[PDB]
Amino acid sequence: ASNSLEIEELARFAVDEHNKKENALLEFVRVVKAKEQWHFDYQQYNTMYYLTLEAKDGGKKKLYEAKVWVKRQLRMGSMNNFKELQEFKPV
Amino acid sequence: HMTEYKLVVVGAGGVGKSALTIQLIQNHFVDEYDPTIEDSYRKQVVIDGETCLLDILDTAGQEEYSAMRDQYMRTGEGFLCVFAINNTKSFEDIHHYREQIKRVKDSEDVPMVLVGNKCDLPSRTVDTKQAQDLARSYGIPFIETSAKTRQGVDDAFYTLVREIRKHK
Ligand SMILES: Nc1nc2c(ncn2[C@@H]2O[C@H](COP(=O)(O)OP(=O)(O)O)[C@@H](O)[C@H]2O)c(=O)[nH]1
Numbered sequence: 001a002s003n004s005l006e007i008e009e010l011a012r013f014a015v016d017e018h019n020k021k022e023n024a025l026l027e028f029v030r031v032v033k034a035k036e037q038w039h040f041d042y043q044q045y046n047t048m049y050y051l052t053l054e055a056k057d058g059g060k061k062k063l064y065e066a067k068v069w070v071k072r073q074l075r076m077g078s079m080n081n082f083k084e085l086q087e088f089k090p091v
Numbered sequence: 092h093m094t095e096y097k098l099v100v101v102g103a104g105g106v107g108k109s110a111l112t113i114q115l116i117q118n119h120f121v122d123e124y125d126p127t128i129e130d131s132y133r134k135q136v137v138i139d140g141e142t143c144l145l146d147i148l149d150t151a152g153q154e155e156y157s158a159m160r161d162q163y164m165r166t167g168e169g170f171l172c173v174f175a176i177n178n179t180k181s182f183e184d185i186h187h188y189r190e191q192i193k194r195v196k197d198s199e200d201v202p203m204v205l206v207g208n209k210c211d212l213p214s215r216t217v218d219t220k221q222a223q224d225l226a227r228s229y230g231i232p233f234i235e236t237s238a239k240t241r242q243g244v245d246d247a248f249y250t251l252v253r254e255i256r257k258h259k
């Protein structure tokens with residue numbers, strides 16, 4: 001069930017990926033807004049997640065917009081999963 | 092607040108319909124389920140954040156009279172069409188299972204997944220390419236599963252639910 005993900009899981013992924021890429025220490029609080037846009041093709045069940053989340057930055061609660069891209073693709077009888085943080089910026 | 096999805100598992104005797112269904116319901120391999128018995132199951136599962144109730148019929152055949160099977164075939168929203176990768180005849184039969192579904196639904200575009208089960212076996216007779224070509228010609232997704240190891244079981248059922256969503 002590894003490609004069945006909830007909004008909260010994708011928001012934690014976004015914060016964790018940002019912290020890794022930018023050597024930051026944002027602490028996830030909650031999701032404020034989410035838009036999920038599914039993109040279907042033959043054997044493709046892909047989703048763009050537009051997330052507004054609250055995270056603590058140096059002890060101060062701030063809002064961030066994150067975009068997470070998820071690919072769920074069947075190739076030669078096998079499910080192929082991919083997740084990437086596309087964008088993370090303060091509001 | 093559950094979204095109900097009515098699913099039907101079809102395919103030749105012996106391909107693993109019962110084993111696949113029971114892996115999803117009971118999370119273990121039941122390797123000797125009476126090949127003549129049909130049963131339905133109600134599985135509460137969260138898929139992509141949606142709380143779902145999967146109403147699943149495990150069919151035992153398409154010839155013996157069954158009010159329940161006729162009802163599920165007519166009103167079913169999505170179908171797993173299962174063959175075994177070591178049984179060429181089960182793969183050749185897929186055409187006839189798909190034709191029955193298209194006929195009872197009176198539609199060319201019915202949510203389906205082609206499932207090549209027993210992908211644990213070394214005794215493959217149906218090449219992945221051969222199965223993928225058939226699925227592509229039908230416009231239906233293809234996945235290989237093992238009910239024995241539970242490989243691909245969740246993805247087959249989740250894929251069928253995602254196929255139903257595309258069509259709803
Ligand atoms: N090796 C292997 N055997 C399987 C698998 N799934 C089912 N079987 C066996 O294949 C036979 C038929 O399985 P069953 O689920 O009863 O098939 P059904 O007639 O389609 O319901 C039984 O002997 C099962 O133990 C699998 O994934 N791998």
Ligand SMILES: [Mg+2]
Nearest residue numbers: 108109125126
């Ligand atoms: Mg059976």
